[PDB]
Each structure stands twice: as structure tokens, then as C-alpha cells.
Design a protein around this ligand. Structure first.
Ligand code: SF4
Ligand code: SF4
Ligand code: SF4
Ligand code: SF4
Ligand code: FES
Ligand SMILES: [K+]
Ligand SMILES: [Zn+2]
Lengths: 84, 48, 51, 95, 207, 106, 125, 688, 114
């Protein structure tokens, strides 16, 4: 029932994605080190609401809104998925 | 045509034919073009 | 550019063959406009409103 | 010429013939398949090549304005004959 | 007088222009545009509210006397928000003259029936309703006239397909003629004919 | 006169046909010639207007003088290239003389 | 006297079209690309609306191309993209709009053909 | 600022200096007649059809070549201008052959159309015409040179675009002849484009010869899938059949050109086609069956396997709708072995960051680069239209091009640095002199071909090339927004596969061989039955019977790219969609619908039943996949370079040798081109 | 948003016209079956009338409702005066057309139409 894939969507320029842009710029490299075998797909697209997608076994997915999230809120949100 | 015979050609019918509708000689339409798409033929050998 | 050339001209002259080809495929273009035109037909006034 | 398939159905000058197992040949049962026997590809090949004394010859198909549009054919290549693109008559320049 | 060119009649162009602004002066409440073509046909473009006032004036006024309604039709131009242009062609026997009056409407806006002005307009409006779906208010008897009973759609609209949506045949099981979705043994072959080179510079639109 | 077909698959007759009664396909012949592989006239679509023979640049498609060819079935009036060529071979003696009489008005 | 109607314009019920050819269709709104075989640009002026292509099959009798799609030949012309989009919405068609592609302005210089030191020097005329 | 005012028929227009009279008329929407002028070729000024009167000037000027001057009034419709067009048109038609009925140009001919609009309606030429012999220049372009009007467009295109100086003019005067003088074939990867630019029927398509007339064709605007460039095309069909492929202008991709494979391989769509579902009978031979029977056999096996037992390989021509549908189906049996044949090193960031596997400078950006470093690639054959863009910059901007790899012919001169992969480390460390060029460059562009990542040391080569690009960016002198690192892809389906999360390469399948394998149009031969358990159940979905179909247990016929509306992402990351030009043949079906139908029978119904809904699914996985025609930027090269240094790999001592070395290798690179009889003629011509 | 009305000034007025039309159709069905000598029952005829009114239940534009009622009145007049023939009346029942199943799989097996 475990985690299978994480996808992060964000805009390159909208202020709503600033925390996510910070998280990738600062904490993504260390996140990938901890989970070298975990696909963490970062996909930028203009004028999208930032979202965190997690895919668990047998194709179950849940998304979490990161709109106007701080880099700290992003870290907590990812920590829940990697843990819970 | 006795006085002014028509110009002879080797491809002109030597034997005139009347209306053949309703008979076994009647014209039947069909498409004059060859098949357009060629289908893959599977191999005749077992290998799988 | 409106009426097709004679067949003998169509078979000798380059311009005539081009115009014959274009008149019988695309046809002549007509400047934009609209007209109601009528004649005294045998049954009365026969007209077309042509756009 | 007009060949027959192994089924006996005449092959047309366009190469058409129903293959075995094609139900559509039922339309000929009790009737016939209209096939023109005069194959133009065979007939034109029978024409002799015309020898001319000039590098360029014109063809209108014959009959003046009853033929095809008049075209001019270059005869500079000796590796082949010039062929009229309308009627298929062949021309050659002699020596 | 070049033999292959249509001659110009400048006297008619002047006469029709003068009468064109004569109508604009008298009915300014409705007239929106007046024009005369290069073959001397005068067109009056009006607001649809003025169909009865303008047509009544042209029929009855002593300097107009357009007693005969030669034709009443519609044109569908989908790119306009008012896609339907309604065209009245009128004839004046007293002055041996013709005039075209044009107005507009859309799918949901009614036009006043002009039967009170011209009794000829009765069937012309039924045809416009039938072929274009334009509703005419206060028509004595508005119903289809050309299409089949129960026919659905308005065929002369540009977006109605050429071969429609249904076709008929006799069905032996139900012992009657039935309607079914249209299938064509040979689809109509659409030809793209327009040359990619401009033909008439005089009509070029600004970029 | 050689027996070669006049039609070179230009499709002018097909383009002008007011009824869309003509259907044509073409390809290079085995000798390279530009010739049709399909040439159908739906005689139940045709309006016998003669535009096709006006449009033809080589006098390939004509309307002949025969008017006595009514049939017992609809399918018998869907002419393909074989039927139309047989018509030409059948009627060429009359057709050539009719064209001789009128081609100076064309 | 005028009434206030604040709903969107939707004439789908009074146009007489069958349902399968409203909701299942996909309209394409575009400016036709120039035919590359010719330089003229006069067929790239107006917007066009066309529908998705559906099956054509061979007629068993003659081999003709049969269709059961009543919209197969339907093409509409519009002055602007906005006019085409408004027409599609009121008729209930889902649509795809594509931006007009305009040729980029180019710098043409006949004299560059004979450059003293650049690669634009041509070797033939 | 420097705009000068001119007048066109009395209407003022403001133009930059250097604008021609022809270009000034365009600004008010007037198209001057032309034959020799092409806006993408050098100015010639020889046809004289563009002559136009300048007000108060006694002499008409060549509009295509004359720069405008301040205050000029161009009389595009004056009697002086009109009488000039009639005179020139009359000279153009004097010797022109009466060929329109037998000429393929008829109906889409500029000579016909401009004679109608600008010429006179009759002839006064009472002499005999010129006749010219024809010339063989290969199996793709037929030459009927008596129709040539000596406009020299073909000559200029061959020299300037294709980089081939084989065409020219011989003789002089009225006897001037366009050709090659000697017997020679014009077999460039861009050769077919001279059919388009030739204004007359002098140059025409041999495969297309005599088959159609322009007015009767229907035009489907679509996308080419023969490569990863994503060239825009028009598919010409008639009566349910594809007739030809034409280019479609896209300034930022292919301009108005296509490659020969794009142009002429469509005839491979009429051969070796899968048209009926097939299963194995009791003798082990493939036999036709119904969709019901065929999907039940697959559904039964899908229900009996889980996890690593089930894998799938996507081939080169697969669309994104099928890719996500197949991923969702396998994920519902808890399988994640979704692989592509085309490898990409998964080390470090792998496919986490889009910038790691994209042409980040974009195709048009090559025009603004001052140095290009090509590594382990043959862009001429891998991406012909991208290589044409490089030659455009080489010609017009004096671009400097260097290449690490085999010394292939790129149709323009370049600095060949060698072929050893170790040269990259030298450039990075400053030992190599070319390192000075990169530091001095204000807009460098390092392009690493996907062909070079198919080696076993691909991750090492990507790390080395990425290291070079990092040093350039770090050392400053490059504007902040300028991207340096690029990957040139050659597979149409690759970028959409990596966007959706597929694993690049079949390395995953090799480690854990599955019991059930889906070959989604996979015809590279990467996985055979030697690599699988003896009883492996293989399902092939595709449009051609090529390499994968004959070894399958079940064959599900799918639609080719001309037969579906499907999403393809090109090497820039730009998503585009094809349109249905004709429906699939026989019992073939749209590819994502086969997977959607299978999911229902297997009891794992996917939650999308229409094309729009499956495209909503694409938006949930990678939102850029539904931004059609938009190049979505990708960043975080710094993070990608950081993760790439963690695990060091050894480069191989094998020199970088691209798969395609000469033209003969270019024509048959996928299932459709391999089935094309025209592509087979081209291979024969260039090897005999 | 200020437009010329056809008949009804608002949906409340429009719904009144709809109800009056429904009564007229409901009353007429027994006459149609008897006069045209149809082999359907009055219940089938009235169910069909209900089916035709139901398909337009989602309209919220008074002008569109007014046009639907105008056409409904025209259709009723054609029936009452026997301008329609039996074939026209029975076209509402599509008796000769085979069912087209609406499930994804059923469409998938038969062709490419969505
Ligand atoms: S005569 Fe018949 S086939 Fe010829 S153009 Fe007229 S309608 Fe078409
Ligand atoms: S019959 Fe005449 S007009 Fe028709 S395709 Fe043949 S040559 Fe052209
Ligand atoms: S190039 Fe044009 S004008 Fe010349 S023969 Fe061909 S179609 Fe006619
Ligand atoms: S072959 Fe065509 S493109 Fe080349 S010079 Fe002649 S007309 Fe121009
Ligand atoms: S277009 Fe200017 S001379 Fe040819
Ligand atoms: K050409
Ligand atoms: Zn000849």
C-alpha cells in the first residue's frame, strides 16, 4: 500500500508558487538523496496552482494544494506523504 | 454510309450489338481499381 | 477571363490553354456585390437576387 | 493483353480482378464482366518510331484542332526516343 | 465604348443618389446607411424597428410609389452577431425604378411582419421562417411552406449540411415510408477552388 | 487513330461536372503514360449537359448520339471505364462524323 | 419594450441538429495554412471552422467513398477568432482555437549576395 | 525611431530602413506578383514579374530587390505597373509548353494563377517553342524541364538551405538550362522541398505523379512523427485516402520545410498494416479473431499477474494518450515497469527535472547562439530541420560550430574537435583550446544527441557534457535567462514518455523479466524472447507488422498518426496534436481506446471514456502536455548538475559514432519508413 | 442584456405557454390515434409527448422557450388538420432504427465514432 510516485506542479513566476520554487531550489537535492529510488517529478507550467500529487500502490492518488505555501509548509506536506 | 462510308479504325466494333439489358450479356458495374491497403500476412511458422 | 477560348485557340496558344483550364475548374471570379435583376419572362417577372 | 486469373475472371487493362474468396464476384454469376479488349498500352507500342531531321519536333496528335494541344519534343538524347505526353507517339532524330 | 465592357449610366447613378439622401432626410429615425452600386442599384439599410414605417413610406409617398414588392428574402452571414440580413426588393411603376431595403436580425429576435404593407409578403415571410428560422411577428398564418411536414432545422442556414441529417425510404415491415439518419453511397466531394492570389484590388480590405 | 486513349486523366471533366457524376483515379501506366485507373459516370446523377466534353482538352469524353439505352436495373446505369471505352469503340464511326460536322462551331 | 435576459446564448434546442452531432463533435477554429505549392496568401485571410473527420468507407458496388457523417463537408468562414468562438458556443460545439500564424518579418538585402567577407556571398546567380 | 515614411497607392506606411518595395506593399496587405523571389532565399531579381511603378520615376523598379526610399509612392495598380506585368507574363508564356492537362501543377500553379490575375487573356506568339531535355536527379523529384521558367529558386535553395552546390545553370541566353550538367542525383535529406518552391510543374513529386488534382484534396493540418522535431504538416487526402504530405509554416519549428522522410514515407502506411486482432491458434500460428475474443485473452492474463510480472515497452511512434492510458492500466495491477526503447540516463535527477532531457534553448534559439557545441550526434539525419536551422545561423549570423564525434558531413563547415569522449573533460578543465571559445561566447549552446546516450556510458557522457555547461554558466558572461545545456531527441514519443514518468530504456525489464509484456508499437527489437521466460505472454499493439508483431501472442491493431488526434511532444518540450485525416483500416482502433476497453473487461476500468477526458488525465500528470504549441520553460539546471556529480562513472574508450553516418542510413528508421516502397527506392538509389 | 421579447417577458410567463401547449397535445393524442388509425395506444402517444417536453426541461431563456412553443403549436396544427400523414406521426417512434448501445465497449466493437 506504499508510496509509488510524487509529482509537484508549479508555475515558474506566479507568487503562489514561490514557496515551492524555494523548496526545490533549497531542499530538493537532499530530498532526492534520501529517496534515490522514488520518482519525484517536478513539472513547471505557466499559471497553474501549485499541487503535490502522491501515487500509492494500485493507482490510488491524492493531491494536496500548495498555493501560497511557505517553503516550510511544503516541507511538512512532503513529510506527511513520505511518512503517512 | 453507302455514299459516304465512315472512317475505318482497327478498334471499332465489327459487329454491332443491340440493347443487352435484361439478358446474360448485360453490363454489371464494378470498381476498376486495385486494393489500396495491403495487410500484413503473419508468418507460417510457430515461434512464440 | 470570362468566356472560354475557342477549342482551336485552346490547343495552340499557351494563354488560351491556361484560361480554358482555369475557367472549367475554378471558374471566373465575380467582384463582390449584390444585384436584383429581372426580365419579362413568359410567366411574368423572373428575377434573381444574386450575392 | 486480357489475361484470366486462375479463377477464369478476365483481368482488365487497369489490372483489376477479384481474388478468390472475394464475394463480390457473385455479381457476375449468370451475367458477365464487361472488359474492353483493346488495351491502349499494347496498341500504342505497335506504332513505329518516327525518324526526323531536327532536334525538336512538334506533335498535335493529328487532325489539326481535333488532336491534342500542340507540344514540342526535344530529341537530343540518343539513349531513348522522345514521346508525346498526350498521345504516346515516339520520335527520333536520325544521325 | 469598349466592346467587352459594360457601359456606365451616370445619369441613373446621380438620380438614385439624390433619392437616396432624400429617404435618409425623411426617415432619420431608422435609416443607417444608403449606398448606390456601380450598376445603379440603390440600397437602404435600416434598423429593424423601422420595417413598417420605411416600407409604408416607400409604398405610399407621392414621390416614391413603390407599389410592388418584387421580392423578400434573407441571407445568412454567420460571422455577424445578427447573422440574418432581410432584403426587400421593391418596384415603382410610376417612376420606373427599383429600390432595395435591408435590415437584420438574429435567431431569437422577431421582425415585424410587413403583410399589412404588401399582401405579397405573406408567403415570402413563410419561406424565410421555413428556410432560415426568422420569426415574423403578427403574421396572419406563419408555418413551414417548402420543407416536409415535421422537418427539423432551417436548411438555408450556412451551418445546415447540404444533404441534411435524415433521408427517406419505404420499409416493408412497417408498410410505410420511414426516416433514418442519412448515409451516402458516395459522399459529396468538397472542392477547394479559390485561387490564393487576389483578384480585385478595388475591394481589398485594410490589414 | 493509333488506338491509344485520348484521356490523360486531367480531371477537368470531373471538376466541371455540375452533378458530380464523374469519378476519376489515375496513376502512371506501366509505360509511364498519364492514364486513368478509374473513370466512372453515374448516369443517374448526370444531367446530360455536355459540360464535360466542352471541358475536355483532347476530345476524350463525348456525349454520343445514342438515346436508346434504357435498362431494367439501376445498377446498369453506373458506368465504369470499361463500359465507357466499349461505348467509344461501339459508336466511334458515328461520333467521329458528328464531331467532323460541328467542330468548326467549337 | 426590451426585456432583460441574463443567461448565455444556447440555441441547441431550436437548431434542429441531432444530439449525436452536437455533443460528440469537435470544432476546429483556425486560419488555414498557406498551400505550400503556391506563394499567394489570399487563402490565409479569414478564420475557418471545421469538424472532426469521421469514417469513410468503400462502396461495395462501385468503390466510391461513402460517409455517414452529415458534417463532413461543413466549413464556416469568419472574420475574426471571436466571431468563430461565439458561433461555436451558441451552437453547443466544443472547439479548439489555434492562433493565427503570421510570417515573421525578414531582412532582405540584395547586396548581401556579394559580401566582401561574409558567408552570404553567393557562388552563382 | 529610424522608421521612414513611404506611401503605397497614397497610403502612408512606416518601415525600417532596408525594407524592399515588395515588403512595404505587404504591410498594407498588398501582395506584389513574383516568381523568382522567395522570402527565405537570397534575392535574385531575374524574373521581373515584381516590376512596379514609383510615382514620378520614369523607370519601373524590381520591387523584390529595390529598397524603399523616404517619400516614395508605390503605384501597385497603375497602368504602367499593369502593362509591365502583362509584358513579363507574355514573355514567360512564349516558350512555355501547353502542358496544363498533363502537368501535375495544374490547379495549384503560380504561373496559371498569376496569368489569370495579372497577364493578358490571349497570345500573339506565332513561332515555334523551345524544347528542353529532362534530367534524372533521383527517384523523388521528376523533372519536366521544358516547363522551367529559369527562376533559379531551386538553385538558391540547394545552395543556401540544403548546403548542396550541385544545381546550376548551363549555357546562356534562351538556351540557358537548369540542371547538374553531368548525371547526378540530388539526394539531400531536404531535397523534396524543391518541389514546393518550384513555381511551375518543372519539378514535381514522383510518388505523387498523376494521382490527384489540388482542388479535390482535403487538407488535414497535423504533425510529423518521423522525428522529434515535430514539423508541422498538411495531410492531403481524397475520398478516404492519404495522397501526399506537404509542409505547414511554423516559424519556430520547421519554417516551411520538411525532411524527405516526412514528405515521402506516407506510402508506408499502405503496407504491412495490422487490420484485425490476432491470437495464436492450436498450432502456434497467428489467426484473425474478434476484438471480444482478443481482449478477453489479454484481460484474463492481466488479471492473473501483478507487480513485476507485468511490464510494457512503448515504441517510437506512440502518442501521449496511449502512453498515460497504458501506465494507468499497469499501475492498477501495481506494476510500474513502464519502459521506452530509447535510453536516457536515470542517474542523479534523471527524469525528475524536465530541463534534464530537453532542448532548453529551443529550436528558434539557435538563431541567437554565437557558438554551438555538438556532441556525439549527427543532427543532419537525426533532426534534419534542426540542422537546417543551424546552417541558417551559420550562414546569416556567422555562427561557430564545433563537433565532438565522427567527422560527418553537416552541409556546412565546422571545427571537428575529434571523437574521443575524453575531449569533454579537457574542455571542462580548460586544457583544450576550444574552452577559450566557450568562455568568450556570450550565448553558447551545448547540444548532446540522444543517440550518444544509447551507449553504455551514457550517464558519464551526460555528466561530462552537463559539467561543461555548468562551468560556462557559473563563470558568468552569459545572460541569466540564456539556457546552455540541450538534449537533441530523435524519437517522436520520447519526451512525452519522460514527462509522464516512464522509465527510459528496457534496463528495468532486463533485471526482472515479466510474465506478461505489452509491446506498445515497440519495434526496435530491444526485448526478444531470449530475454524473457519461455512462456511469457506478449501483447503487441501497433499499426504495422514489423518486428514486434510476429513474436506476439496477441495482436491488437492500432491507429497510425494520420488516423488519430493524438498528442506528441517534440524535443523542445512543445506539445502538439495530430488530427484524424483518415480512419484506421479494417478493425483497427484508436490506441488509447484499446487500453480503455481492455481495462473494463479486466475489471480495472480507467476513469476516462473520451479523448477530452483522457487529456484531462494528461493534465493531472504533467500540466504542460495540454498546452498545445507552447514551449514551457524548464529550470533547475543547478540542481540537476549537483545530483549528477554524486556518482561518478567511467567513460568508454569507444569513440562517439552516430548510428547514421551517410544518407543511405536516413531513409528507414521506423516501422512506417521501413514499410515505404518509396523509402526503399531512395536507399537503392544512394547505394547503387 | 436588453433584448426584444417574442411573447413571454420572463420564464414565469413562458412556463404558462408551455403548460397550455402540453394540455393541447395531451387532449389531442386520443384523436390522433383514432384518426390516423395508429396501432400504438393512447398511453404510448402521451408518453411520447411527455418525452418530447422533457428533453427541453433545462431551458432558462424565455425567448428560446417561446420559439419551442411556437414550433410546438405548428406541429400540433399539422397533426390536427391531417396535413401530416401516418408516416410523419410515426417518425417520432423511430420504429425501423436498431438500438445503438451507449456503453463504451459496445461503441468500441463497432467503429470509431465516440
Ligand atoms: S453531361 Fe453529365 S457527366 Fe458530363 S458534365 Fe454534364 S452532368 Fe457531368
Ligand atoms: S476525359 Fe478529358 S477532361 Fe476528363 S480527365 Fe480525361 S482528358 Fe481530362
Ligand atoms: S507549370 Fe502551370 S502553366 Fe505550365 S503546364 Fe504546368 S500547370 Fe500549366
Ligand atoms: S526548375 Fe522550377 S525552381 Fe528551378 S529554375 Fe526552373 S522554374 Fe525555377
Ligand atoms: S520577383 Fe522580383 S524579379 Fe522576380
Ligand atoms: K512545383
Ligand atoms: Zn501527340
Amino acid at each position: 500500500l506504499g508510496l509509488r510516485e510524487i509529482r509537484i506542479h508549479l508555475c515558474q513566476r506566479s507568487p503562489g508558487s514561490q514557496g515551492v520554487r524555494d523548496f526545490i531550489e533549497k531542499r530538493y537535492v537532499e530530498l532526492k538523496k534520501a529517496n534515490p529510488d522514488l520518482p519525484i517529478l517536478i513539472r513547471e507550467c505557466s499559471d497553474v496552482q501549485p499541487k503535490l500529487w502522491a501515487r500509492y500502490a494500485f493507482g490510488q492518488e491524492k493531491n494536496v494544494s500548495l498555493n501560497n505555501f511557505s517553503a516550510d509548509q511544503v516541507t511538512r506536506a512532503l513529510e506527511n506523504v513520505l511518512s503517512s | 454510309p453507302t455514299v459516304k462510308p465512315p472512317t475505318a479504325r482497327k478498334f471499332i466494333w465489327t459487329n454491332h450489338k443491340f440493347n443487352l439489358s435484361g439478358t446474360p450479356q448485360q453490363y454489371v458495374p464494378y470498381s476498376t481499381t486495385r486494393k489500396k491497403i495491403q495487410e500484413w500476412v503473419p508468418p507460417s511458422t510457430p515461434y512464440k | 477571363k470570362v468566356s472560354p477560348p475557342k477549342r482551336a485557340e485552346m490547343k495552340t496558344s499557351m494563354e488560351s490553354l491556361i484560361h480554358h483550364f482555369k475557367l472549367y475548374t475554378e471558374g471566373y471570379q465575380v467582384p463582390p456585390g449584390a444585384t436584383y435583376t429581372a426580365i419579362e419572362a413568359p410567366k411574368g417577372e423572373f428575377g434573381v437576387y444574386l450575392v | 493483353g486480357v489475361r484470366t486469373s486462375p479463377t477464369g475472371e478476365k483481368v482488365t487493362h487497369t489490372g483489376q480482378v477479384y481474388d478468390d474468396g472475394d464475394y463480390r464476384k457473385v455479381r457476375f454469376v449468370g451475367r458477365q464482366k464487361e472488359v474492353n479488349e483493346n488495351f491502349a498500352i499494347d496498341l500504342i507500342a505497335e506504332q513505329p518510331v518516327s525518324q526526323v531531321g531536327s532536334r525538336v519536333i512538334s506533335c498535335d496528335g493529328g487532325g489539326g484542332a481535333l488532336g491534342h494541344p500542340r507540344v514540342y519534343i526535344n530529341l537530343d538524347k540518343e539513349t531513348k526516343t522522345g514521346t508525346c505526353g498526350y498521345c504516346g507517339l515516339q520520335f527520333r532524330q536520325q544521325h | 465604348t469598349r466592346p467587352t465592357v459594360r457601359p456606365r449610366n451616370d445619369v441613373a447613378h446621380k438620380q438614385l443618389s439624390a433619392f437616396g439622401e432624400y429617404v435618409a432626410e425623411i426617415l432619420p429615425k431608422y435609416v443607417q446607411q444608403v449606398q448606390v452600386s456601380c450598376f445603379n442599384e440603390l440600397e437602404i439599410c435600416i434598423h429593424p424597428d423601422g420595417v413598417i414605417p420605411v416600407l409604408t413610406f416607400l409604398r405610399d409617398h407621392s414621390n416614391a410609389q413603390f407599389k410592388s414588392l418584387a421580392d423578400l428574402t434573407a441571407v445568412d452571414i454567420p460571422t455577424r452577431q445578427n447573422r440574418f440580413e432581410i432584403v426587400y426588393n421593391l418596384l415603382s411603376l410610376r417612376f420606373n425604378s427599383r429600390i432595395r431595403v435591408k435590415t437584420y436580425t438574429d435567431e431569437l429576435t422577431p421582425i415585424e411582419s410587413s403583410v399589412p404593407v404588401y399582401k405579397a409578403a405573406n408567403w415570402y415571410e413563410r419561406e424565410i421562417w421555413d428556410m432560415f428560422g426568422v420569426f415574423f411577428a403578427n403574421h396572419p398564418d406563419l408555418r413551414r411552406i417548402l420543407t416536409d411536414y415535421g422537418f427539423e432545422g432551417h436548411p438555408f442556414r450556412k451551418d445546415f449540411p447540404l444533404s441534411g441529417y435524415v433521408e427517406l425510404r419505404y420499409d416493408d415491415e412497417v408498410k410505410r415510408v420511414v426516416a433514418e439518419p442519412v448515409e451516402l453511397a458516395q459522399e459529396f466531394r468538397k472542392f477547394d477552388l479559390n485561387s490564393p492570389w487576389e483578384a480585385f484590388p478595388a475591394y481589398r480590405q485594410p490589414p | 487513330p493509333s488506338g491509344e486513349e485520348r484521356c490523360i486523366a486531367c480531371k477537368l471533366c470531373e471538376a466541371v461536372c455540375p452533378a458530380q457524376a464523374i469519378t476519376i483515379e489515375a496513376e502512371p501506366r506501366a509505360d509511364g503514360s498519364r492514364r486513368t485507373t478509374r473513370y466512372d459516370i453515374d448516369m443517374t446523377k448526370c444531367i446530360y449537359c455536355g459540360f464535360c466534353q466542352e471541358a475536355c482538352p483532347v476530345d476524350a469524353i463525348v456525349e454520343g448520339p445514342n438515346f436508346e439505352f434504357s435498362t431494367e436495373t439501376h445498377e446498369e446505369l453506373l458506368y465504369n471505364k470499361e463500359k465507357l471505352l466499349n461505348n467509344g469503340d461501339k459508336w466511334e464511326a458515328e461520333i467521329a462524323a458528328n464531331i467532323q460536322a460541328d467542330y468548326l462551331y467549337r | 419594450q426590451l426585456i432583460t435576459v441574463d443567461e448565455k446564448l444556447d440555441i441547441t434546442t431550436i437548431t434542429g441538429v441531432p444530439e449525436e452531432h452536437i455533443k460528440t463533435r469537435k470544432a476546429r477554429i483556425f486560419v488555414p495554412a498557406r498551400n505550400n505549392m503556391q506563394s499567394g496568401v489570399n487563402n490565409t485571410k479569414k478564420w475557418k471552422m471545421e469538424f472532426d473527420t469521421r469514417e469513410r468507407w468503400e462502396n461495395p458496388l462501385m468503390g466510391w467513398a461513402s460517409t455517414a457523417d452529415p458534417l463532413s463537408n461543413l466549413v464556416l468562414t469568419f472574420s475574426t477568432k471571436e466571431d468563430a468562438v461565439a458561433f461555436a458556443e451558441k451552437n453547443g460545439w466544443s472547439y479548439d482555437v489555434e492562433e493565427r500564424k503570421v510570417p515573421k518579418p525578414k531582412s532582405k538585402s540584395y547586396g548581401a549576395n556579394f559580401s566582401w567577407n561574409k558567408r552570404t556571398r553567393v557562388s552563382t546567380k | 525611431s529610424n522608421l521612414i515614411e513611404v506611401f503605397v497607392d497614397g497610403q502612408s506606411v512606416m518601415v525600417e530602413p532596408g525594407t524592399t518595395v515588395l515588403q512595404a506593399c505587404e504591410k498594407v496587405g498588398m501582395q506584389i506578383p513574383r516568381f523568382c523571389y522567395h522570402e527565405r532565399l537570397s534575392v535574385a531579381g531575374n524574373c521581373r514579374m515584381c516590376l512596379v511603378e514609383i510615382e514620378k520615376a520614369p523607370k519601373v523598379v524590381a520591387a523584390c530587390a529595390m529598397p524603399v526610399m523616404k517619400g516614395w509612392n508605390i503605384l501597385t495598380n497603375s497602368e504602367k505597373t499593369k502593362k509591365a506585368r502583362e509584358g513579363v507574363m507574355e514573355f514567360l508564356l512564349a516558350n512555355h509548353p501547353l502542358d496544363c492537362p498533363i502537368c501535375d501543377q495544374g490547379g495549384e500553379c503560380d504561373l496559371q494563377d498569376q496569368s489569370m490575375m495579372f497577364g493578358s487573356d490571349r497570345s500573339r506568339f506565332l513561332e515555334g517553342k523551345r524544347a528542353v531535355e529532362d534530367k534524372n536527379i533521383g527517384p523523388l523529384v521528376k523533372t519536366i524541364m521544358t516547363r522551367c521558367i529559369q527562376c533559379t529558386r531551386c538553385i538558391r535553395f540547394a545552395s543556401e538551405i540544403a548546403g548542396v552546390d550541385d544545381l546550376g545553370t548551363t549555357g546562356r541566353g534562351n538556351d540557358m538550362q537548369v540542371g547538374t550538367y553531368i548525371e547526378k542525383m540530388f539526394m539531400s535529406e531536404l531535397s523534396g522541398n524543391i518541389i514546393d518552391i518550384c513555381p511551375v510543374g518543372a519539378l514535381t513529386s514522383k510518388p505523387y505523379a498523376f494521382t490527384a488534382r489540388p482542388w479535390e484534396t482535403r487538407k488535414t493540418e497535423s504533425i510529423d512523427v518521423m522525428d522529434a522535431v515535430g514539423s508541422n504538416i498538411v495531410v492531403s487526402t481524397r475520398t478516404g485516402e492519404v495522397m501526399r504530405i506537404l509542409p505547414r509554416m511554423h516559424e519556430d519549428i520547421n519554417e516551411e520545410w520538411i525532411s524527405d522522410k516526412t514528405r515521402f514515407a506516407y506510402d508506408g502506411l499502405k503496407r504491412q498494416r495490422l487490420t484485425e486482432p490476432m491470437v495464436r491458434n492450436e498450432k502456434g500460428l497467428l489467426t484473425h479473431t474478434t476484438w471480444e475474443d482478443a481482449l478477453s485473452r489479454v484481460a484474463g492474463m492481466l488479471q492473473s499477474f501483478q507487480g513485476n510480472d507485468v511490464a510494457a515497452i512503448a515504441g517510437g511512434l506512440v502518442d501521449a494518450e496511449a502512453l498515460i492510458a497504458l501506465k494507468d492500466l499497469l499501475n492498477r495491477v501495481d506494476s510500474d515497469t513502464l519502459c521506452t526503447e530509447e535510453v536516457f540516463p536515470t542517474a542523479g535527477a534523471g527524469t525528475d527535472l524536465r530541463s534534464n532531457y530537453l532542448l532548453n534553448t529551443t529550436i528558434a534559439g539557435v538563431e541567437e547562439a554565437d557558438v554551438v557545441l555538438l556532441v556525439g550526434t549527427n543532427p543532419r539525419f537525426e533532426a534534419p530541420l534542426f540542422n537546417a536551422r543551424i546552417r541558417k545561423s551559420w550562414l546569416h549570423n556567422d555562427l561557430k560550430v564545433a563537433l565532438i564525434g565522427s567527422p560527418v558531413d553537416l552541409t556546412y563547415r565546422y571545427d571537428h574537435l575529434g571523437d574521443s569522449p575524453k575531449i569533454l573533460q579537457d574542455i571542462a578543465s580548460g586544457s583544450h583550446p576550444f574552452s577559450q571559445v566557450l568562455q568568450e561566447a556570450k550565448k553558447p549552446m551545448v547540444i548532446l544527441g540522444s543517440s550518444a546516450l544509447q551507449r553504455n556510458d551514457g550517464a558519464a557522457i551526460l555528466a561530462a557534457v552537463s559539467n561543461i555547461a555548468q562551468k560556462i554558466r557559473t563563470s558568468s558572461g552569459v545572460t541569466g535567462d540564456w539556457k546552455v545545456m540541450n538534449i537533441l531527441h530523435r524519437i517522436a514519443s520520447q519526451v512525452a514518455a519522460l514527462d509522464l514518468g516512464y522509465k527510459p530504456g528496457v534496463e528495468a525489464i532486463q533485471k526482472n523479466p515479466p510474465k506478461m509484456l505489452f509491446l506498445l508499437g515497440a519495434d526496435g527489437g530491444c526485448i526478444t524472447r531470449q530475454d524473457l521466460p519461455k512462456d511469457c505472454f506478449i501483447v503487441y499493439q501497433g499499426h504495422h507488422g514489423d518486428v514486434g508483431a510476429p513474436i506476439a501472442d496477441v495482436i491488437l491493431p492500432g491507429a497510425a498518426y494520420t488516423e488519430k488526434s493524438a498528442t506528441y511532444v517534440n524535443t523542445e518540450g512543445r506539445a502538439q496534436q495530430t488530427k484524424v485525416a483518415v480512419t484506421p483500416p479494417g478493425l483497427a482502433r484508436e490506441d488509447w481506446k484499446i487500453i480503455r476497453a481492455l481495462s473494463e473487461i479486466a475489471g480495472m476500468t480507467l476513469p476516462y471514456d473520451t479523448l477530452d477526458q483522457v487529456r484531462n488525465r494528461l493534465e493531472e500528470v504533467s500540466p504542460n502536455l495540454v498546452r498545445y504549441d507552447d514551449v514551457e520553460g524548464a529550470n533547475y539546471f543547478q540542481q540537476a548538475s549537483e545530483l549528477s556529480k554524486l556518482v561518478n562513472q567511467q567513460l568508454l574508450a569507444d569513440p562517439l559514432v552516430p548510428p547514421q553516418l551517410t544518407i543511405k542510413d536516413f531513409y528507414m528508421t521506423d516501422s512506417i519508413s521501413r514499410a515505404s516502397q518509396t523509402m526503399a527506392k531512395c536507399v537503392k538509389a544512394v547505394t547503387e | 442584456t436588453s433584448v426584444k421579447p417574442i411573447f413571454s417577458r420572463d420564464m414565469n410567463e413562458a412556463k404558462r405557454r408551455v403548460r397550455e401547449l402540453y394540455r393541447a397535445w395531451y387532449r389531442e393524442v386520443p384523436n390522433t390515434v383514432h384518426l390516423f388509425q395508429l396501432d400504438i395506444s393512447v398511453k404510448q402517444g402521451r408518453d411520447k409527448v411527455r418525452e418530447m417536453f422533457k428533453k427541453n426541461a433545462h431551458i432558462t431563456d424565455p425567448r428560446v422557450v417561446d420559439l419551442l412553443v411556437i414550433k410546438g403549436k405548428m406541429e400540433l396544427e399539422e397533426t390536427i388538420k391531417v396535413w401530416k400523414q401516418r408516416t410523419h406521426v410515426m417518425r417520432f417512434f423511430h420504429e425501423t432504427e436498431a438500438p445503438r448501445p451507449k456503453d463504451f465497449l459496445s461503441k468500441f466493437y463497432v467503429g470509431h465514432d465516440p
